[model samples]
Target: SATLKVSDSVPAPSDDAEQLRTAFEEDLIISILAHRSAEQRKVIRQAYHETYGEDLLKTLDKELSNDFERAILLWTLEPGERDALLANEATKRWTSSNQVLMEVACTRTSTQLLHARQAYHARYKKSLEEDVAHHTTGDFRKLLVSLVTSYRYEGDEVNMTLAKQEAKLVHEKIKDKHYNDEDVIRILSTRSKAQINATFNRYQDDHGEEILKSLEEGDDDDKFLALLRSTIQCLTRPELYFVDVLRSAINKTGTDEGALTRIVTTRAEIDLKVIGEEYQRRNSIPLEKAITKDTRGDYEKMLVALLGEDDA
Candidate 1:
């Protein structure tokens, strides 16, 4: 099922595809999106071009100017290209967190990620890791370079003995404020997801709180620690992590539509159903209802469409 439903993409646009050339509406565009997966959308892109004599993406790019338009077009991208494109954008950001690149590298399966890198190289003529290194500086650059470059071990056979020792090492380093301790970078960046989970769980068991909380016990705004913290949660509880991202985006006085759009479009076919349930369990309202409360007009329709019919 690819974790997405046709109903979710539904109200499949019945309007003439060519009608959109004379006039545009978000609701109608969303209807077409509601019916098609990204693959089908790519196929339809061809259809829309032949029938309308304009490439769909270029036409949309020319006419629409906001996050809604941007999101719809991005959603139309095949998943591999989407990950490559997202990682590419993250490499170009002048910022603290590499949310885009980190999510792709951390959240995807190893094979899926290899495909992402191949797609990146095909599209950009340079490796994703090389671009990450070129854009970042200091320890941050080193950590990101190692992460994008690693093909992590996929086995679930964790070493409890090793986890115990690493937990203590992690505690001592952070407790000593040696946030850039070389071992810390090596451990976080290279360990398999299973081993890292064992290490962090052992850390919380030994230290009385999560490794991340302990890292933040004395300092905030330590960029290295901030990046480390994001890395662990992303490698571990990604859905809950993104639940927070979605909440922040929705709760902002003016929504961060770009963040909201990115999360929804990318995750919908992967784990949005699970994420939606987590959001309801944690926030006490469904994710769709949150969308209804925060977003407006055609944007609102497009979002709730992806979320399924809004009853709350």
Candidate 2:
């Protein structure tokens, strides 16, 4: 999660253009790709256009190809546009399960999520909520629709008494094996992240196991399995969850470039540094080394730039 700030003494965009033209072989453009915060990238884009008189988008596309090309090209867009783009594809298909919906719904602050919904509408000429409902079926649809539509209380306020009560409420539904119980969905879908964690903590203390472990026990219900896990991740350790996503992306035989790009690009400005550390702990190898080993060319360069130096 390198925040590549636009700063003094960096070569002008003209220099970038010149270097890109000559060292295009090494993916030299990536020299500036890593750690750029959104604001800085916006400046970089304008500078490249001003300096080279060429659209950066066109330039990157022309120079790169394959998954590397696609991820870098996507990296150029603001996260809002990227979220809208990802959501449009997910909405178009309406699968009961998808990372796009989870990331879009679960990753952002309430306001950020609102803007994503707004971006979705602005780009696609439709409501994200409407499209989410149109494509999925059963309680998963109901839960997802609620999640994407919610603007939960974002404050740190929590009531231990209420947490105990909600813990009991949550436990009752799980114990009954009515995993799709409306109260369960409502509690998960509407509660603040802090509040949810409190309730989960209470549940764990009372029951001697975390809610997720319990969810795993009778979780033979495969339909909402993704959603249930998604709910827990969103409420609990999202960074831990994304660490696994990054690992999955890099460890796969062919590499899930889509997942790789989504996590790095989306989380860079948010919690990617933490995910990087988490990755190191989980894999016992730095994330940059993992990216370097699995990827090549300019694409690899750009990913490493965003990934930061390996722990030394």
Candidate 3:
């Protein structure tokens, strides 16, 4: 599935000027520092300009000197706009810098990665991969090149046999409990539900049992195993995935922003439409209805918008 394209034109704030003053001055600064929504940041920028009559970006640069502060400020801006600006800055500093390559490549979603490629080619009339090659070498360089070029979730007609073999290998590697490769985590996290289902079906067919069932029967209490099982289950079935995600969000005795963010943001980008269709086909109830009944506040509204109508 492709990523959703948001409008280039940002909406003006609907709140009163006095409300903006209070919200933007103290609350918005904290939100920006805490890496809040892109929408929230834009509203804060408008309010800041109204109150101080100064460029928000300029003021941020003048005040915030730390790396985290700078990153948050950049992230607060529109995703495409921020990357367009950074692409030029990156070009100037492109020289034997694996850090820069990884920084740019790893952070982007598949769609953002595509845009970055376009931005780099338009600005420098050069391939982004070629720039990375010139800057880095060896296995690290190969990894970065793969990440930049692969465009995660862009695969077509997944090979079920290969996926199963890979998943089995992953399972065996974890079962052995001897190695500590972080790449496994990275690979699993980046795979789409379709790719995951292909692998999981293969695993079950080959092993004569579900991966999670095997883990449970083996009495595995390892946190990694638990996570892997959850991943397998969610990837294998959409309804189960929705149930798991919603349960995680609603059952959070503590703030579960990370869980909430993952489900909402991922649906916005990729599978929300599919999930909605699946929900209706399976239960005769729209996915949006489930979301509405389960969540509240602005975050809930945003998620509902992303989910859209039942047909959507």
Candidate 4:
């Protein structure tokens, strides 16, 4: 059964709301003072505009002091928007800001990173990688630029040979309690369920042990292991993926924001349409209903929009 909880607050700005907005702004200012990243600052900036109809960066600059304020303001600009602007400025006067370079190159997702590269080239008529190389040195910058230039995922078709090889690697890593390798996680995360199933089957046949069983026997890291297992298994069979996500969403007494965030973020980028339809089919309830029952206000609206369909 789904539960619907509603609060009786007017959806308009008022005196009380203004005071709350000021408090929120102060809290955000405090957070910025602690440790600021471009992503967190951007979230805060968006929260400010949505609540107060004010420009957050501009307000912050007026209110705060020192280079810290400048750094935070610089971060508030959207990634693409900032990169495009910086591209123009770099051509006219080539000075490098390491933070800006990292933000444009590293923090964005593969899709957004690709667009930023394209936008940078379009604005400056020069390659972003070239500019980055000139401005920055060392392995970190090199790795960041390499990641930006590389394709989002390897496009090689998954065959039995590769699957067996990868599954063996995965099994040994998990079996030995050394599954924290990012490369292993990335490979498993990006593959489809069919590809994963082939690998899993091959691994089980070759090793005479199940990978999931091996992971379950390891340290009490169920959530992380579940994510790894789900990545491998859900590649070829996404219905299994959705079923687990729904189960996680509803199984507990209260909502799990981490699970909710993963499902929302992944589906928003990947096969959200398929995931939505499958969620309804499996649960015998509309996906939107489940989400709305579990979340509230603008967050709910954004989640619904990301779901990409409205109930009639």
**C-alpha lDDT of residue 2 in model 4:** 13
**What tens digits encode model 4's per-residue C-alpha lDDT throughout 1-312?**
111111233223333334435654533333232233334445555665677787556644452433334433333465565555544344334332223333233224456666767777776777777766665444334433554464444344568988888877876677667655555655554554356667888888998877666666765544344444444444445545555656666555423323443345333434556666777888888777887775455444445544543221
Candidate 1 on 1-312: residue-level lDDT in tens? Answer: 133557443322323355444345245577667557766676666666777687667744543467677777668777777788778878877355555666777878788788889999899999998889889888788777877887888999999999999988988988888877888888877888899999989999998988767766766767677777777888988887788788888887423236788788888877888888888998999888888884466776777777765332
Q: Please provide TM-scores, in order, for all candidate models, with all chains considered together.
A: 0.84, 0.85, 0.44, 0.42
Clashes of 4: 4
Considering every candidate listed, which one attains the maximal TM-score?
2
* Alpha-carbon local distance difference test for all models: 0.75, 0.74, 0.52, 0.51
* lDDT, candidate 3, 1-312, per-residue tens: 322344354344434334435543543433222333456567766776777787456634443344333533454455555555454454445433213344345445679778878766775788777866666555445445655565677556687666977777766755655223354555545665467667767777877777666667543544334434444454355445554555545456423233444444434444556655665676666656755675454444444544543122
Off by over 4 Å in 2: 1-26, 47-55, 58-65, 219-221, 253-257, 310-312
Name the best candidate (by lDDT).
1
Give candidate 1's TM-score: 0.84
- Which residue pairs clash within candidate 3? none
Clash pairs for candidate 4: 192-235, 193-235, 193-236, 194-236
Which stretch of 10 consecutive residues in model 2 shows the poorest summed lDDT?
A: 1-10
In model 1, the runs with Cα more than 4 Å from the true position are 1-3, 7-26, 46-54, 61-64, 253-257, 310-312
Cα RMSD for candidates in order = 3.6, 3.4, 10.4, 13.0
